[PDB]
Symmetry: C2
Subunit: 118 residues, 2 copies
Amino acid sequence: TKKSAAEASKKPRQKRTATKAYNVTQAFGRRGPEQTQGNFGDQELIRQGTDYKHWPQIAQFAPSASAFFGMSRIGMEVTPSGTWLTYTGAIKLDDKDPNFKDQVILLNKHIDAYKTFP
Amino acid sequence: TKKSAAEASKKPRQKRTATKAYNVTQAFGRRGPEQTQGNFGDQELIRQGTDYKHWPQIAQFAPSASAFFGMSRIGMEVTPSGTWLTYTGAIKLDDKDPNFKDQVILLNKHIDAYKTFP
């Protein structure tokens, strides 16, 4: 029953789950500055994906499918590469959560982390 | 065991699941043009949420938590309303899926649908 990395890659990109065996770079591409690239994750999170120590503390901010379509600004664009469903939005952190300060520190660690990789 | 609408509202906004009993407007606010508002869903999808006939065909495009953090451009902004985790990205439709044409029609039905509500 244990899935191979190849089996994990069969999922459409938006449904993939990164792990140590099939990591963020492998599932989602290198981190970088371009619009088409993801910018989130330090070297530890990139190499570990959902096996990362603080994954549950990151995932608490990810939207359910209902919320993704409920909260976001959704669009459609046709380009040479194909037809794309575009999305933007924002998620409010709970500054009454006693973990607020740690959540900010955690998110900041990963945002644009690639800029200081050795 | 059946959850009340009040119980559904206890979830953080990004984790809510809209249904007929706790619908898109109730969970996620009115549709509209502002940056802070969602723009997706016709009257049927708004009133039904995940009970909508074509929900599975919409949800196939929503990201897993790993993909949401892997694919998107993530940021943090502090405003008067609080601290926000910002996100943008795009999801490619599979133009080899025999359902492609129907997926485009479906998404277009819901994008900015509020503009033609009676």
